[PDB]
CSV table of C-alpha atoms in Angstrom, one decimal:
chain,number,residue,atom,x,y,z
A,1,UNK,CA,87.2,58.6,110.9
A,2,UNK,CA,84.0,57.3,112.4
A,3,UNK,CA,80.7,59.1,112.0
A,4,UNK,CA,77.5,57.7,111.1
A,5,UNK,CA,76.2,58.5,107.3
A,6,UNK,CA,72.9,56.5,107.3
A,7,UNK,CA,69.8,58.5,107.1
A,8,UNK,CA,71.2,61.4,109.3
A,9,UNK,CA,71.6,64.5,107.1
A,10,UNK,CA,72.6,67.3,109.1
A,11,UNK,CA,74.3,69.8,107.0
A,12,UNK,CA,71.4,69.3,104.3
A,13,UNK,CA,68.4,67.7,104.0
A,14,UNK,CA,68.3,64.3,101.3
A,15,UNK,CA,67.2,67.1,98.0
A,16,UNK,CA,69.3,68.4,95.6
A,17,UNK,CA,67.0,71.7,95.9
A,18,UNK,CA,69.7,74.1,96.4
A,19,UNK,CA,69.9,78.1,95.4
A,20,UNK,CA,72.2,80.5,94.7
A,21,UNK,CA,72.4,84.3,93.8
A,22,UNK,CA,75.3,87.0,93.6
A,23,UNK,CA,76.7,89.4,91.5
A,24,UNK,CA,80.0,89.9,89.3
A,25,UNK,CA,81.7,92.8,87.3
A,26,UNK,CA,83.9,92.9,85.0
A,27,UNK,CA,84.5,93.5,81.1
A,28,UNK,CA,81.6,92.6,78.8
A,29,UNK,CA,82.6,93.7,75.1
A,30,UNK,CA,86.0,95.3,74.1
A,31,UNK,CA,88.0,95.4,70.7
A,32,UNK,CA,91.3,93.9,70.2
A,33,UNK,CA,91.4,91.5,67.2
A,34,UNK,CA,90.7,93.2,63.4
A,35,UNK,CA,91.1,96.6,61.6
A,36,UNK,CA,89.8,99.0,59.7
A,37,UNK,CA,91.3,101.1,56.3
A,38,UNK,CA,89.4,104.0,57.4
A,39,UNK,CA,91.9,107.4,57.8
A,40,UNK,CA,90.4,108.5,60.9
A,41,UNK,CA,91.0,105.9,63.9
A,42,UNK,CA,90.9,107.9,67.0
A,43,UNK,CA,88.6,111.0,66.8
A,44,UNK,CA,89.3,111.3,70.5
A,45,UNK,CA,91.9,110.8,73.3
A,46,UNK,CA,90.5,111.0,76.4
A,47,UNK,CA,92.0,110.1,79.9
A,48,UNK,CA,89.6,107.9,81.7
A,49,UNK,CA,89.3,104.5,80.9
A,50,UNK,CA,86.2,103.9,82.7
A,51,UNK,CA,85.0,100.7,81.7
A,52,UNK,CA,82.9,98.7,84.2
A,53,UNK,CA,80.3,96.1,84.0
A,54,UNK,CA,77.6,94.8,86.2
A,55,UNK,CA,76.7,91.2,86.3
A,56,UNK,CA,73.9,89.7,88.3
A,57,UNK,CA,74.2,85.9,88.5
A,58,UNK,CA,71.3,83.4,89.7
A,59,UNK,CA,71.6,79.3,89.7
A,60,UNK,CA,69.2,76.8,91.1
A,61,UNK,CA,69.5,73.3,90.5
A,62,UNK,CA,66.4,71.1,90.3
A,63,UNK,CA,67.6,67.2,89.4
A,64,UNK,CA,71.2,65.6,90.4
A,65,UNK,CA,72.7,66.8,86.5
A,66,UNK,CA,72.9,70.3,86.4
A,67,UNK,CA,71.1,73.6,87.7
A,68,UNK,CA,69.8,76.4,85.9
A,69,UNK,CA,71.7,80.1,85.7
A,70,UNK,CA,69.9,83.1,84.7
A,71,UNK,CA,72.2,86.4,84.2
A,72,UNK,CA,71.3,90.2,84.6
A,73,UNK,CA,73.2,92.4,82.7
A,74,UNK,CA,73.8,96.4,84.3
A,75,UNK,CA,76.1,99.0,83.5
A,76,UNK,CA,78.8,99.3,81.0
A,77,UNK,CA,79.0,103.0,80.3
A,78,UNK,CA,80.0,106.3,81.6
A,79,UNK,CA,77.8,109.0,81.4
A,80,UNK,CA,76.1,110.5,84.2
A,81,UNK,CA,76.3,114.3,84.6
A,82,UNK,CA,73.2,116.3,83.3
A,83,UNK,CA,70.8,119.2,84.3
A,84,UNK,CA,67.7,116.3,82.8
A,85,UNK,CA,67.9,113.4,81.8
A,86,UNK,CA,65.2,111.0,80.6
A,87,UNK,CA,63.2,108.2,82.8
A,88,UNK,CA,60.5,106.8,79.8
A,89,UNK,CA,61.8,103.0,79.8
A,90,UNK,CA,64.0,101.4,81.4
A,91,UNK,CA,66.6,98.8,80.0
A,92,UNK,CA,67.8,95.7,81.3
A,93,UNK,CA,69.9,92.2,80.1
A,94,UNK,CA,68.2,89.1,81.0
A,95,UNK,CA,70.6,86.1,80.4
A,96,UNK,CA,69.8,82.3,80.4
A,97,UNK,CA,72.0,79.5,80.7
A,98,UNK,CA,72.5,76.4,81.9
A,99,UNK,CA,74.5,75.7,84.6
A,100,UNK,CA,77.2,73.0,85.8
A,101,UNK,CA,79.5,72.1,88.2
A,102,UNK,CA,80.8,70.4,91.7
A,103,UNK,CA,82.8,71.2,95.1
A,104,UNK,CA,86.1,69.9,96.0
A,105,UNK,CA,85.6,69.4,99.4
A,106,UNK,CA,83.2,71.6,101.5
A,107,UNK,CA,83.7,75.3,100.1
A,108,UNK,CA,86.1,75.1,96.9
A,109,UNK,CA,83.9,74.9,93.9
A,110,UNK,CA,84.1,75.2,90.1
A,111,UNK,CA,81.1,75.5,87.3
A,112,UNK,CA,80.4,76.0,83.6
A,113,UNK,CA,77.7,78.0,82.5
A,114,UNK,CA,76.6,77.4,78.6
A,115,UNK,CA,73.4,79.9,77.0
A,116,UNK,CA,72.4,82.8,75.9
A,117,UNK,CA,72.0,86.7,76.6
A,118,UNK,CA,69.0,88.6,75.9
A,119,UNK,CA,68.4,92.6,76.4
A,120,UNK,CA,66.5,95.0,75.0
A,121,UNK,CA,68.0,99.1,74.2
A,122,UNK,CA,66.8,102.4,75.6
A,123,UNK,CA,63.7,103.9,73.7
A,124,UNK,CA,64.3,107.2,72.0
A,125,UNK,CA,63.6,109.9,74.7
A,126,UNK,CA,65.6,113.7,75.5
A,127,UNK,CA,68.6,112.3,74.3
A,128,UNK,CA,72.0,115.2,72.6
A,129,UNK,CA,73.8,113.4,70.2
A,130,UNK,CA,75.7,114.5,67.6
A,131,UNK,CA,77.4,111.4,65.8
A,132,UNK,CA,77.4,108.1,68.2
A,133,UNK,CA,73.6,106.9,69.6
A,134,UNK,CA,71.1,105.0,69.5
A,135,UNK,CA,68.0,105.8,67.6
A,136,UNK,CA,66.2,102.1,66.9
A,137,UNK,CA,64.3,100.2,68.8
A,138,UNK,CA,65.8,96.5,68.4
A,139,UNK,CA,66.7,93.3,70.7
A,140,UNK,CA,69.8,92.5,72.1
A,141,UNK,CA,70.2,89.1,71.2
A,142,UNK,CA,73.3,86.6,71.8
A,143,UNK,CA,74.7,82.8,72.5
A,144,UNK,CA,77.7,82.9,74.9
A,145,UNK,CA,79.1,80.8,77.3
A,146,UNK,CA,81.4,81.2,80.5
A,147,UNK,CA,83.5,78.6,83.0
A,148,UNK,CA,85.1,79.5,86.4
A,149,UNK,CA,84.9,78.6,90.1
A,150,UNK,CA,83.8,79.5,93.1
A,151,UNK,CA,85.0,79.8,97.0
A,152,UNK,CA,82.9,79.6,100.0
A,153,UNK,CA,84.2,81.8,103.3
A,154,UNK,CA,80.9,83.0,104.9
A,155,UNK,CA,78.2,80.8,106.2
A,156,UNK,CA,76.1,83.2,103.5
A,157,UNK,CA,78.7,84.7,101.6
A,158,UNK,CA,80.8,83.3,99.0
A,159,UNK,CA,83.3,85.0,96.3
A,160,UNK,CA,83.4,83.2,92.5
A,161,UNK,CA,85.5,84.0,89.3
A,162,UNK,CA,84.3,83.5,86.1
A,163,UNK,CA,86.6,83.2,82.7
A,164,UNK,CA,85.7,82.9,79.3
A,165,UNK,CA,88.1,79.6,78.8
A,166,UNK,CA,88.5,76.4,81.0
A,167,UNK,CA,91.1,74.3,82.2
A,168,UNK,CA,89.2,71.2,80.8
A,169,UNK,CA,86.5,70.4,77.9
A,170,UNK,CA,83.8,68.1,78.8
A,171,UNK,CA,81.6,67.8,75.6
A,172,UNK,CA,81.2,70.0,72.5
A,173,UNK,CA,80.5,69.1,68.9
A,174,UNK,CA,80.3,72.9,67.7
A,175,UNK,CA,81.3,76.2,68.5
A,176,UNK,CA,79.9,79.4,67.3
A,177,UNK,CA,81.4,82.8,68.9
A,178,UNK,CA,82.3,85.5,66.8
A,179,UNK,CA,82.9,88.5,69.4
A,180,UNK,CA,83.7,85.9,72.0
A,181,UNK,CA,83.2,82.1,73.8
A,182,UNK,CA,83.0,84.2,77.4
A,183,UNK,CA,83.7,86.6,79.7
A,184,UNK,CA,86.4,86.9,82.5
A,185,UNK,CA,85.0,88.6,86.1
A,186,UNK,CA,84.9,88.8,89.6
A,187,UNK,CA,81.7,88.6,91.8
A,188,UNK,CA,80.2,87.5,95.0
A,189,UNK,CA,77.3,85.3,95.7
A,190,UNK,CA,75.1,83.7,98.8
A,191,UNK,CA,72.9,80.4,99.0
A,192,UNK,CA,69.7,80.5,100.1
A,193,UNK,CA,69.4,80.6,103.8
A,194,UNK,CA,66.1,81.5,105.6
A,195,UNK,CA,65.1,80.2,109.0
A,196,UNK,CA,62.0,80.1,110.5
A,197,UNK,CA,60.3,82.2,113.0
A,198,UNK,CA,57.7,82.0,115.5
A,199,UNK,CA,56.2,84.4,117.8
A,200,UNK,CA,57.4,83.0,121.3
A,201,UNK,CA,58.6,84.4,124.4
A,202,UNK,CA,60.0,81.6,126.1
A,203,UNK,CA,63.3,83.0,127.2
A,204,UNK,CA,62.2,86.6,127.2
A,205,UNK,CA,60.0,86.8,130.8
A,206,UNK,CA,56.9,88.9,129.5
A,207,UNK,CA,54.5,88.3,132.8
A,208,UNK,CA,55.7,91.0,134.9
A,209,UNK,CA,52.6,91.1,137.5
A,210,UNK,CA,51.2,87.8,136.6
């Protein structure tokens, strides 16, 4: 083991100025815990479980403590099959948190992200509902907060998994999470890479005549 660690950065130049961006899916709300003395539980019994959410996950860290994370949530239902459907407003989650974490060695990573999740619902438009919908205008408004890691295998492309508890517990004085503390998923991310570019032929003979 001999290589020189002076004032020679190769792999990355002497700022914490890094950025990150990807995407996970997975399950974002779902009952399991608490009942109801209603008669009628199951009104119907389909057979398609299709229950998939969209996650898009962005962190950048700006001082050698932690790095910010701001969340998009997308999809979540199924229901796509219509002669016209409606276009008015579009809907979308915005999440921020606050980001933390460290590598292992050079591509195994883990991280805790600790906020919020705000979105707003779909405006009233040519909607057929005859029991379940949504006819206010309100916003989506939540705390939450997720841990998991992350693994590196492309020079631009790296997988994570996120959970909604951790192996460890850093610092906490109080926790307030009715539905949940955070949310289990897989996704994908890449840092971000962009080289420069010049317009110059010097390889590529141009000067055919002269």
């Amino acid at each position: 083991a001999r290589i020189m660690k002076a004032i020679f950065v190769l792999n990355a130049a002497p700022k914490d100025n890094t950025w990150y961006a990807g995407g996970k899916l997975g399950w974002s709300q779902y009952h399991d815990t608490g009942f109801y003395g209603n008669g009628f539980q199951n009104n119907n019994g389909p057979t398609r479980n299709d229950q998939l959410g969209a996650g898009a996950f962005g962190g950048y860290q700006v001082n050698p403590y932690l790095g910010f994370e701001m969340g998009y949530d997308w999809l979540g239902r199924m229901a796509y099959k219509g002669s016209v459907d409606n276009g008015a407003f579009k809907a979308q989650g915005v999440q921020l948190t606050a980001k933390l974490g460290y590598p292992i060695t050079d591509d195994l990573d883990i991280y805790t992200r600790l906020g919020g999740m705000v979105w707003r619902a779909d405006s009233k438009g040519n909607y057929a509902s005859t029991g379940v919908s949504r006819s206010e205008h309100d916003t989506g408004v939540s705390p939450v907060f997720a841990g998991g890691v992350e693994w590196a295998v492309t020079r631009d492309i790296a997988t994570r998994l996120e959970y909604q508890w951790v192996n460890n517990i850093g610092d906490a004085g109080t926790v307030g999470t009715r539905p949940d503390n955070g949310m289990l998923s897989l996704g994908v991310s890449y840092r971000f890479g962009q080289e420069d570019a010049a317009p110059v032929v010097a390889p590529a003979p141009a000067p055919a005549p002269e």
